[PDB]
């Protein structure tokens, strides 16, 4: 599914990330722009053999099991498939997570290099939420 851009702020919103650890709404839309263009259905192979899935790009060498990425830990406890779905409760759910390990929205370095320090607020601006 490719979320619009409002849809997917108050999808987010409902699903308790707006202000979660402190991080506004906004730089999750941002954050979810640059790592998907909203398309849940995004993979994205990493040099290391991990690949990143979802709507925000979750990476299967921590988050979850993909069946071919050795080393690996699964700390989200699902199938990276499960990441994929129109319904963005699992990514969700394991973005939590990821945000609460320490840096922040530093985990993903698309939030570090293009979102952070930037009027994230313009992503959720005309939006009914
Ligand atoms: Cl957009
Ligand atoms: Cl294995
Ligand atoms: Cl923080
Ligand atoms: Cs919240
Ligand atoms: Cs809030
Ligand atoms: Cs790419
Ligand atoms: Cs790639
Ligand atoms: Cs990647
Ligand atoms: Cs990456
Ligand atoms: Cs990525
Ligand atoms: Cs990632
Ligand atoms: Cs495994
Ligand atoms: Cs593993
Ligand atoms: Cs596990
Ligand atoms: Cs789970
Ligand atoms: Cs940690
Ligand atoms: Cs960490
Ligand atoms: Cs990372
Ligand atoms: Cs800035």
Partial sequence: KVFGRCELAAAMKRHGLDNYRGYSLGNWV?????????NTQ???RNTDG???????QINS???CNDGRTPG????????????????????????????????????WVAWRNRCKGTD???????CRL
């Fill in 30 to 38: 941002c954050a979810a722009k640059f790592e998907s263009n909203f």
């Fill in 42 to 44: 995004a993979t994205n």
């Fill in 50 to 56: 991990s690949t990143d899935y979802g709507i925000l």
């Fill in 61 to 63: 060498r921590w988050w």
């Fill in 72 to 107: 690996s830990r699964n700390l989200c406890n699902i199938p990276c498939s499960a990441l994929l779905s129109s319904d963005i409760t699992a990514s969700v759910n394991c973005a939590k997570k990821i945000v609460s390990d320490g840096n922040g929205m530093n985990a």
């Fill in 120 to 126: 994230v607020q313009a992503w959720i601006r005309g």
